[PDB]
Amino acid sequence: LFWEWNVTWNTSNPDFTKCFQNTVLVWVPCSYLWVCFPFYFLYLSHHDRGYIQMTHLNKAKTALGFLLWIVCWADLFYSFWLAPVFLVSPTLLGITMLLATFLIQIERRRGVQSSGIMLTFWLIALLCALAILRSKIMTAVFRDVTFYIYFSLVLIQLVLSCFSDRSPDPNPCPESSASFLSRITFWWITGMMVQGYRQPLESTDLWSLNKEDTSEQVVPVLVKNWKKECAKSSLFKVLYKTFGPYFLMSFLFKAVHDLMMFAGPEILKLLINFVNDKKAPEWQGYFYTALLFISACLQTLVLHQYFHICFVSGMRIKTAVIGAVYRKALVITNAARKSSTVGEIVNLMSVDAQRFMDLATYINMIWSAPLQVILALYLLWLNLGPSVLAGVAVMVLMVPLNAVMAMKTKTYQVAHMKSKDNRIKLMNEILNGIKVLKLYAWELAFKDKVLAIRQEELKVLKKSAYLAAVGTFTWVCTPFLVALSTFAVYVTVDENNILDAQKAFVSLALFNILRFPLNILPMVISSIVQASVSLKRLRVFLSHEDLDPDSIQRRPINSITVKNATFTWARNDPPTLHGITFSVPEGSLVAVVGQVGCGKSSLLSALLAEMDKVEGHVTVKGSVAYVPQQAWIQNISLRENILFGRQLQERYYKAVVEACALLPDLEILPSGDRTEIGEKGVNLSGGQKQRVSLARAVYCDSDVYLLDDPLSAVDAHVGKHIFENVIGPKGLLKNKTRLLVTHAISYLPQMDVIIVMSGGKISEMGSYQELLARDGAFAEFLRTYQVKLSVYWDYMKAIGLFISFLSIFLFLCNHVASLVSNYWLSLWTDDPIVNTQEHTQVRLSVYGALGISQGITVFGYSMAVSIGGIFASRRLHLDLLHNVLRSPISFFERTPSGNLVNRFSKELDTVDSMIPQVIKMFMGSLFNVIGACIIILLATPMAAVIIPPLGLIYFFVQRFYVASSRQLKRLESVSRSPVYSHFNETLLGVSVIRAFEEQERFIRQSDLKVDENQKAYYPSIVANRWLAVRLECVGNCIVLFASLFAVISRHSLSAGLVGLSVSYSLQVTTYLNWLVRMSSEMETNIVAVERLKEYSEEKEAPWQIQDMAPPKDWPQVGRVEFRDYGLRYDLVLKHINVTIDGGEKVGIVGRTGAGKSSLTLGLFRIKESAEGEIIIDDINIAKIGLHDLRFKITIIPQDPVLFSGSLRMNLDPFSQYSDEEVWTSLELAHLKGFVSALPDKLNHECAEGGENLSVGQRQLVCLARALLRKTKILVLDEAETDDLIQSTIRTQFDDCTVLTIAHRLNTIMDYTRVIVLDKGEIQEWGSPSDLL
């Protein structure tokens, strides 16, 4: 009377036995709350949130828990008033009920608004009660009424448990306040999604993070663990175990998900067996159908809990890594600073942290993928037998083959990356010197130079396309690669074996499962190798030696005290300052004096605890303001540069700004002091950078100032003014202890104390007059001296219509072939079993041929698609480059250089890497979903009525997801860049920050910048889970209906038709979610194509008109004639009617604001003539093509910008002039001695802008360019080597006509026929003799 099959599996009324009802159905819920409870105290204790108040809901639940216990014990009372189960079961139920009410009580105490255990437990109890209820109502007072009361109370308790209790910024994330049901299905983001449909998302209306995802909590925890280990020993992975306890729930969730996923094919086997057998009740089939849907729903909920936990752990890992690296960068010693690069360190933060999030999502595969394949193997084995091994051998041949590919893809990126940077380093060199480049027609040469690098880069992309082809091939047809071999061996080995519907289709479903773990595991292994590579970098960085923090005694308010102190720049390097001793009293001006490399700047570095103190005692008293030699400028506005995170005082600020003589600099700058100075914003001259640095130090109002050569780049008058109003005894810092490093004698007599040193050693310090009287070292020193479809059509044109249509045809052929192969397997399964099947050889051969066609087609579209991607990228980059180069300088000056150089990099990276792969994934998923839907209706046509409900809801999520995700996927991208770009700045001014003691402010700044990025990132990773849960639920509904419609119509179809319909239904779930994701990725990445075709409407005079082309000797004499010239800019140039005769030296004089320089722009047609007819000799300029005239006229600009490469490519990019001409021109440019000195001869590799070369040399190289050009018309733009360049321009260019715009009248006096420009008009036209 406990368990039989007659009343439970062979009867049309599926009733449970009486004993089963009273034993197992009651042991399930009571025992469910018994194994988790002891484990629930762990969570309830470790995690606390206060206590919830006394509410009616909490009490209602507690009172019903008391009554429920009574009712269950009331049964024991009546039993006490024969059957053994009538004693233990009621008491056990009462006791577990007493545990339930105690649990809601303690959950109130521990502050859990919504409970998961107190919901699943009631759900399980309800289902058990429902089963007994149905049985008890089918049986029909004494003990039944107690059960009805129990069931009603349990139902009301379950309904109550759904509501969220009262709680223990104006925009907190609803993560914490959401109930259990909302947390399971991620419903709390729905509003944020739906708002994303009408109200465009902004960084302000974004949620704030939780307390578990903020830098202030995640970073100090990892820092403490890192400190504990170092002192304990310093290994690293040991520390990452801290994330383990949280990451541990991922283990349980993945373990549950694996079994839940494998419960699918078993139910499919049961269903196929049911359809095969005629003598079976319909309720049996309905049971399997409902069980499959329940299993799928539990699987998806568990999987998306696992994924969310895994993603949150990775985000925390990134946050902790960023925080730890930033906090360490402020403490590492000098040698460690130089051990890396301000560049590599930033790249370490940018790459290692991202790799950790990238790894986290699939690190669990190392233990899950093996189980997800091994368990399938055993299921396949018991289904088929030994023939499985012959299949798995192919699986063996798949892992290494797939791994080597993942090995190649790992390395090819490197060969691509170094090729990309080499391009992007060159493009800036083009963009910085665009005017000089387009002054004498270097557009083509540099275009070809860039295109060569582009081709070298595209070779690697072609190789990566060939690799990704095999990768996709394996991913797509690994299931069938296994299936064909396994079925062939199974049929061939033995004649007696019969392949029915259940074997073939359950094995096919199992292979569909095997597909994922097989092809993800090598990718996980490669990612682990990369992460372990990055771990070594993080180890060697975090383990760096921090500089002694107490080396310098910083006593709060004899001002500076040094006795017998020797300092080093490294532990093993020799001392730089040997045995220094000096006492600087309060409010005294001390000047450090020495030669180059003496040790002056080292003294100020040592007073800031930047040098490594090998011995001594330093007692700097009070706050220190450091003015470094190399000025550190924050990208913030000039006002905040001077303020330096300090309260603004209008009177003090306005006293500081002009005392540094920053008023003219404020005037020239556009926005004044609100202008964005720094590398990214407006560039500033060195002297201006010094003034701002000094102004910042003066505003900081310290007592001790360390001025490491503040007046190096300021002019003599500006320097004297600054010293008078700032550093001098009658300036701003009169009472401040100033210690200045100088090599200028002009202010030395005003200094109170002069510390003169030699070779890092104190050498007879003293006051100026006393030192002069002593006549020693100081005397010697003094004596020394919604995307539109048009974008998609444009991209498909860029690929090429033939390639695009061929790729589309090959997908259709691949997917039709796969569908036909599966249908053929379905026909094979249900064949006359005439003892076995006789079509075996024929059907096996046909199935093999279809699969070979499938594989050949798959490798086909990828190759076409992948090659089409390369073709489109090549054409897009070429078009962009041609449009930019042909564009006038007005674009360059109007559009920011940063925005333009963004597309030359990010857009090309997107088109080169992301777009083709996303198209492949999107179209593969779309065709798989369409094919599965097609098969569903082929097997069950009545499933068409299920389309409208799903097709509506699928329409909504698809409409709600992409409209919102594109915002977040953008909001994150624009927010992660300010993080690293901040760190770089912090890395440039570590010494300044430590001197001002502003570590904490920058720590908070970095924490805030990381938190903003996380705020942008977390909603996206929750939107992924939201979308996936919705679409997986849709897929589970479609599997439910597809199985149900086969069950109801099992007398018209075959288990094979069922086997195929349900098997494809199981595939629909994992493909709908990826289809919508890939639609989102397409709608986000295809905008890059629009950004690339933006400059399509490139606009300058067509080069080489070839219709009015001039003769070879166009400047026959060089007769220039400005005939009523007017230059628009309202008119800078106006009423210009001048004539410069051939071979007549002519200069242009004028003040700032005149049309002097603009006149040169007129000669080279930089700006089109608003009204003018400039004619050289007998030919109009406006008619001639640009290149022609730009080649026949030469210019020596203000600052010659030398381009990266060899000197010969600088002189002659086209290599048109012979080597003898280059040598002669270089000799004639007073450069033969220097140019012969480089070991590379003419191939000297000059860096960006010729940093290695001096300014004089670069000027002479530009003169050499002009001389090598050998043209009759030459223009000069004048600002030490002036004597040399002036003599050289006066030496052999007397034959040629030279215009000269000089800000100095001394040189212009030599040139006859001076033209003076007052405000664009010709004020005077005649020789300098007539001028005076």
Ligand SMILES: CCCCC/C=C\C\C=C/C=C\C=C/[C@@H](SC[C@H](NC(=O)CC[C@H](N)C(=O)O)C(=O)NCC(=O)O)[C@@H](O)CCCC(=O)O
């Ligand atoms: C892509 C292969 C090359 C191209 C092949 C051509 C066409 C293939 C057809 C369909 C494409 C996609 C199929 C399934 C997704 S499936 C998405 C993936 N897997 C799961 O959803 C986990 C479920 C799985 N069954 C398991 O074992 O847990 C995942 O981790 N999602 C995380 C998230 O939600 O963000 C995988 O591609 C994701 C892996 C992508 C990757 O890391 O390269």
